[PDB]
Amino acid sequence: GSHMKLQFNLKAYFKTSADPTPAKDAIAALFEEANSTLLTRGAPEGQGAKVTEWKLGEDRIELTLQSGRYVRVHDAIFRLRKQLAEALGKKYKIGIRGIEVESFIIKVPADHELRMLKVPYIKSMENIEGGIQLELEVGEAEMKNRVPDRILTLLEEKIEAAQYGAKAEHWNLLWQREPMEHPFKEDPTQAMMKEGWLKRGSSRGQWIHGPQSARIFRTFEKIVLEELLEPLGYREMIFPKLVTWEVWMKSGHAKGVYPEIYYVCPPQTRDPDYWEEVADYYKVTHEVPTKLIKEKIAEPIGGMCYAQCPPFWMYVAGETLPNEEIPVKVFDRSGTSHRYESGGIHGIERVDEFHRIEIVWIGTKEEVLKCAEELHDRYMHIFNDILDIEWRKARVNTVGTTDYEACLPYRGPDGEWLEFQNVSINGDKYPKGFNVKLQSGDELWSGCSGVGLERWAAVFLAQKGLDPANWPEEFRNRVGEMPKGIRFL
Amino acid sequence: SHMKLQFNLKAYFKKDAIAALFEEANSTLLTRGAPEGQGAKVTEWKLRIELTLQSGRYVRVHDAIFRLRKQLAEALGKKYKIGIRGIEVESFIIKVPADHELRMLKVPYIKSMENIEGGIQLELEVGEAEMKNRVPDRILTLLEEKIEAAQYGAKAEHWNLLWQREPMEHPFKEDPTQAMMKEGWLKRGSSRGQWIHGPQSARIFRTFEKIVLEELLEPLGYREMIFPKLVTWEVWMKSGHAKGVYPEIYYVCPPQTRDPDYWEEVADYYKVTHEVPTKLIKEKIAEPIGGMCYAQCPPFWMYVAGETLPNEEIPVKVFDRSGTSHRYESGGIHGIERVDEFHRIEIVWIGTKEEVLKCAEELHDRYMHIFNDILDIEWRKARVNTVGTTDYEACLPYRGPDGEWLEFQNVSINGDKYPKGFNVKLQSGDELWSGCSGVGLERWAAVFLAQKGLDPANWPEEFRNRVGEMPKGIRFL
Numbered sequence: 020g021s022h023m024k025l026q027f028n029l030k031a032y033f034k035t036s037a038d039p040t041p042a043k044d045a046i047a048a049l050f051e052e053a054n055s056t057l058l059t060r061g062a063p064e065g066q067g068a069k070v071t072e073w074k075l076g077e078d079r080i081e082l083t084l085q086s087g088r089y090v091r092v093h094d095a096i097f098r099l100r101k102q103l104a105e106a107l108g109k110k111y112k113i114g115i116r117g118i119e120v121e122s123f124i125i126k127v128p129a130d131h132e133l134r135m136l137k138v139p140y141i142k143s144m145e146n147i148e149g150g151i152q153l154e155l156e157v158g159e160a161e162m163k164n165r166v167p168d169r170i171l172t173l174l175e176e177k178i179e180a181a182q183y184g185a186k187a188e189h190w191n192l193l194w195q196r197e198p199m200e201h202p203f204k205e206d207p208t209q210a211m212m213k214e215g216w217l218k219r220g221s222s223r224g225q226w227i228h229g230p231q232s233a234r235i236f237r238t239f240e241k242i243v244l245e246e247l248l249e250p251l252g253y254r255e256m257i258f259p260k261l262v263t264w265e266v267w268m269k270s271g272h273a274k275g276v277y278p279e280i281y282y283v284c285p286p287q288t289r290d291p292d293y294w295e296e297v298a299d300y301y302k303v304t305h306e307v308p309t310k311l312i313k314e315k316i317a318e319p320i321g322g323m324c325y326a327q328c329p330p331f332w333m334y335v336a337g338e339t340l341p342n343e344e345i346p347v348k349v350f351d352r353s354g355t356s357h358r359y360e361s362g363g364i365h366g367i368e369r370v371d372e373f374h375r376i377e378i379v380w381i382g383t384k385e386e387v388l389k390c391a392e393e394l395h396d397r398y399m400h401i402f403n404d405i406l407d408i409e410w411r412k413a414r415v416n417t418v419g420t421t422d423y424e425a426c427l428p429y430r431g432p433d434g435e436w437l438e439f440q441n442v443s444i445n446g447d448k449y450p451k452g453f454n455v456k457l458q459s460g461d462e463l464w465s466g467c468s469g470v471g472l473e474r475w476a477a478v479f480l481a482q483k484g485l486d487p488a489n490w491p492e493e494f495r496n497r498v499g500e501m502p503k504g505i506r507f508l
Numbered sequence: 509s510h511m512k513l514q515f516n517l518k519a520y521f522k523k524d525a526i527a528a529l530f531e532e533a534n535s536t537l538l539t540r541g542a543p544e545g546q547g548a549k550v551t552e553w554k555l556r557i558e559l560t561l562q563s564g565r566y567v568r569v570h571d572a573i574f575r576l577r578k579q580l581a582e583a584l585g586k587k588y589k590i591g592i593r594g595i596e597v598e599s600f601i602i603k604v605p606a607d608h609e610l611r612m613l614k615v616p617y618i619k620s621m622e623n624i625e626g627g628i629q630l631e632l633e634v635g636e637a638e639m640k641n642r643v644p645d646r647i648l649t650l651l652e653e654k655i656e657a658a659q660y661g662a663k664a665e666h667w668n669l670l671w672q673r674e675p676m677e678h679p680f681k682e683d684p685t686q687a688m689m690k691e692g693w694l695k696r697g698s699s700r701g702q703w704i705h706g707p708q709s710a711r712i713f714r715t716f717e718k719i720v721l722e723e724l725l726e727p728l729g730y731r732e733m734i735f736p737k738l739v740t741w742e743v744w745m746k747s748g749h750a751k752g753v754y755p756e757i758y759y760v761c762p763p764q765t766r767d768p769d770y771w772e773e774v775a776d777y778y779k780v781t782h783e784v785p786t787k788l789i790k791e792k793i794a795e796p797i798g799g800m801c802y803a804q805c806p807p808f809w810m811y812v813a814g815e816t817l818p819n820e821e822i823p824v825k826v827f828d829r830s831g832t833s834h835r836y837e838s839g840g841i842h843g844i845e846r847v848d849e850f851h852r853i854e855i856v857w858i859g860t861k862e863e864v865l866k867c868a869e870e871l872h873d874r875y876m877h878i879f880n881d882i883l884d885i886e887w888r889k890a891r892v893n894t895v896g897t898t899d900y901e902a903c904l905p906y907r908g909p910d911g912e913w914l915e916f917q918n919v920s921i922n923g924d925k926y927p928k929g930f931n932v933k934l935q936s937g938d939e940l941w942s943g944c945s946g947v948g949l950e951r952w953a954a955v956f957l958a959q960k961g962l963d964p965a966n967w968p969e970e971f972r973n974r975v976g977e978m979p980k981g982i983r984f985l
């Protein structure tokens with residue numbers, strides 16, 4: 020780690036209506052008092068902002084302002100603006116207009132070099148002793164909007180990622196089941212195809228489930244409702260599946276979800292005449308003109324459901340919950356989630372279109388941890404007593420994700436286990452993101468948990484096979500009489 | 509005006525024996541197929557052996573050049589040691605009769621289009637491979653369909669009443685969507701025509717679903733499946749939706765790559781400005797691969813595509829209720845009666861013509877029982893030979909005495925459309941037909957709640973028993 024000081028350097032001048040040369044005695048007096056009083060507020064001892072030099076023009080008052088991480092220059096300059104206005108407006112009869120930036124320099128500690136990228140408002144970048152120096156192309160509007168703080172946070176993220184969070188996974192085992200005998204060793208996806216349970220859909224990593232596979236999905240759903248959601252007092256809601264930029268901005272997904280989303284674009288207009296060229300092209304060529312269509316669709320409005328819970332938060336956005344209403348415990352099972360997974364075909368263990376029950380809870384810190392614990396107890400009961408599967412759980416501070424993993428015997432003794440279930444304590448992230456308050460003024464937390472039916476199927480069928488005679492009695496009772504598939508010649 | 513359909517072509521293949529060949533061709537060879545001597549004929553002869561042929565409707569000019577491809581290969585093959593490589597076109601012009609001055613259109617393989625005296629003249633950019641693939645045939649057909657539209661084609665949808673329930677007293681008069689918003693049943697989602705359903709509204713949705721399952725799907729022996737929701741061009745081409753569904757689709761584009769370096773510029777832009785760069789994102793996404801679920805049943809048909817069903821397997825009777833349908837609706841602001849994202853149970857059956865018709869009647873019987881006995885709504889049905897759609901309509905009191913009724917349910921007989929489009933055959937060789945019927949939960953809710961209100965005390969006994977105790981919503985300060 021580099022110990023170099025985080026430092027902000029600002030060279031700027033204030034716009035004046037006329038030339039305030041005579042008011043020099045008052046101007047110099049306020050700057051010295053600012054350095055000992057005003058610019059010190061909100062900073063630890065001797066870490067306040069400093070005006071290092073000052074000079075005058077015939078319509079401008081310039082300064083060089085310096086700061087560390089506290090009372091930053093883009094914050095301190097507006098403090099000096101409001102003081103200089105009141106001190107010179109009443110007696111000296113002179114008005115201060117806008118702020119003009121001449122140079123904005125941030126110095127940030129870093130161990131390694133960074134490849135410079137196209138980032139808005141960053142003029143140039145250069146390596147210096149102990150870190151990185153940024154030159155900013157920023158005016159007063161951008162300073163008021165706190166652009167420098169966002170640029171700093173971005174560079175700090177890039178610095179951390181280049182050195183620290185490089186390990187693919189850091190993994191912490193919490194609980195593991197006693198190993199079981201595994202007499203079934205087929206890839207469940209291949210067995211399901213051979214025995215007429217399902218077929219590949221037209222789209223990438225997409226499946227069509229025949230009656231046999233659908234029955235399995237429905238039984239897992241029934242188990243989650245009856246063994247978890249009902250006894251724990253969860254209430255069904257319907258969350259939207261088309262997710263807008265607004266939602267992902269508030270959830271934080273707009274910070275990097277881009278490589279994995281299926282994007283959605285509305286038509287630019289519903290006017291048939293606008294689309295006639297597309298229809299005509301297809302009727303003549305028997306080909307869909309995708310290049311033309313891309314020109315005729317609007318810019319993306321967002322994408323298809325990715326994490327499932329974010330669009331729910333528009334229901335509580337901007338609202339205050341009464342203390343009587345928490346914990347809010349809800350779930351949704353109203354449709355499909357879409358993710359652009361890695362290249363290479365997979366089985367149902369890794370699809371581009373999946374079906375998940377998303378479980379969401381909101382309350383105080385303690386109510387959220389308690390709710391998480393309730394969920395873990397119910398999941399353990401399900402996996403041990405009903406599905407009777409071999410499994411473990413691992414934790415990827417109480418904020419974070421607990422992952423459930425299970426072995427797939429077709430992958431061999433040294434095969435990688437499959438993540439099939441998770442429980443996430445999200446802290447204040449979502450309440451803060453969507454501006455959801457609690458009546459008592461206590462901090463609101465939330466958690467979520469997603470049951471991916473494909474992953475449960477991949478695990479259960481990999482371990483138990485497709486023959487009901489060899490399934491746990493408790494699972495068999497819930498399935499009922501298996502339906503027949505559609506037989507082909 | 510009234511012109512005669514005319515084909516005109518100038519091309520070459522890349523002296524005494526060839527001279528008598530074209531005198532015979534205009535009287536013997538290029539005459540067969542024409543009823544009253546309308547066959548193809550050459551007017552300009554040039555020796556690269558250039559031709560200029562003319563034709564009407566029958567014995568078309570593009571077919572005429574391959575007849576001479578046969579004759580010149582025989583009359584010069586062993587005779588003068590000549591072997592033709594191919595044909596290249598210098599000119600192709602079609603003159604089509606038309607009523608009115610027809611709008612300017614961009615169409616593939618059409619170089620230029622213009623209005624003339626009798627109708628429309630149009631030049632083509634076609635080679636030999638293009639006229640082998642019948643491009644001029646498809647261009648002609650398209651333009652004729654537009655000419656008939658400019659002469660007759662007007663905006664109309666058929667209607668013929670079959671059954672209407674006797675008028676009922678309608679004590680509840682609120683727009684159910686407004687009442688629902690007022691009483692905390694639901695809220696608008698971020699997206700256009702999109703709703704988030706609170707526990708009270710979700711309960712209603714799940715009650716209708718329960719009724720359909722228990723009163724209709726189970727007794728009739730329907731088996732649940734899961735149909736894909738992301739629909740590709742392949743599916744819509746086979747289903748016929750690729751002919752004109754474009755104005756209503758929510759298009760889906762994958763990223764051009766998963767490479768995070770490729771997306772860094774987008775993420776960095778957002779982190780600094782707090783504005784997602786939608787213009788840049790559009791350049792970085794691929795061309796659309798299709799769109800979100802529109803009719804719901806088309807993606808199922810990939811399950812049976814190319815297959816032959818044993819006669820023991822029919823009728824095939826399946827349903828799906830695994831997700832959302834998306835549609836870009838016209839007008840502006842609507843309630844839940846007309847949304848861009850809805851939830852439907854799609855019911856599909858496949859069998860012989862007779863079984864498909866039988867299955868439809870079975871469904872009509874169950875819907876009638878549901879709407880009369882359980883929901884107790886005021887409703888009607890109307891037909892829109894055996895192939896077609898039966899629409900169920902219901903009055904919404906808030907719309908007034910003269911209010912237009914709401915379509916809330918349909919049963920469609922699709923004929924052989926889907927088996928043909930997806931190449932599904934029966935073992936016995938008898939024609940497969942199919943039908944489908946979609947239960948829209950939003951629509952059922954708009955009808956039921958506009959007629960019965962939001963207070964469970966005013967709901968029919970049969971509905972209240974299936975609902976159970978209504979959940980409370982989430983209350984805000």
Ligand SMILES: Nc1ncnc2c1ncn2[C@@H]1O[C@H](COP(=O)(O)OP(=O)(O)OP(=O)(O)O)[C@@H](O)[C@H]1O
Binds near residue numbers: 358360441472473
């Ligand atoms: N591609 C997928 N196919 C099927 N189910 C999925 C997929 N991605 C996620 N899920 C389901 O959603 C749940 C929550 O999503 P999450 O983002 O935690 O998955 P993940 O951590 O990316 O798992 P993995 O890394 O194994 O894909 C998962 O536990 C899983 O059940």
Ligand SMILES: Nc1ncnc2c1ncn2[C@@H]1O[C@H](COP(=O)(O)OP(=O)(O)OP(=O)(O)O)[C@@H](O)[C@H]1O
Binds near residue numbers: 802846850947
């Ligand atoms: N905008 C909408 N909002 C809510 N529900 C809708 C909407 N559009 C359609 N539905 C539901 O879907 C059902 C069928 O719709 P439609 O008549 O368009 O047939 P389709 O099969 O979806 O389309 P197509 O006939 O092109 O195959 C309707 O009866 C209604 O229940």
Ligand SMILES: [Cl-]
Binds near residue numbers: 262324325327328330
């Ligand atoms: Cl999402």
Ligand SMILES: [Cl-]
Binds near residue numbers: 804807
């Ligand atoms: Cl569809």
Ligand SMILES: [Mg+2]
Binds near residue numbers: 358
């Ligand atoms: Mg994933």
Ligand SMILES: [Mg+2]
Binds near residue numbers: 421422438440
């Ligand atoms: Mg996880």
Ligand SMILES: [Zn+2]
Binds near residue numbers: 327328377469
């Ligand atoms: Zn979540």
Ligand SMILES: [Zn+2]
Binds near residue numbers: 803806854
């Ligand atoms: Zn349909």
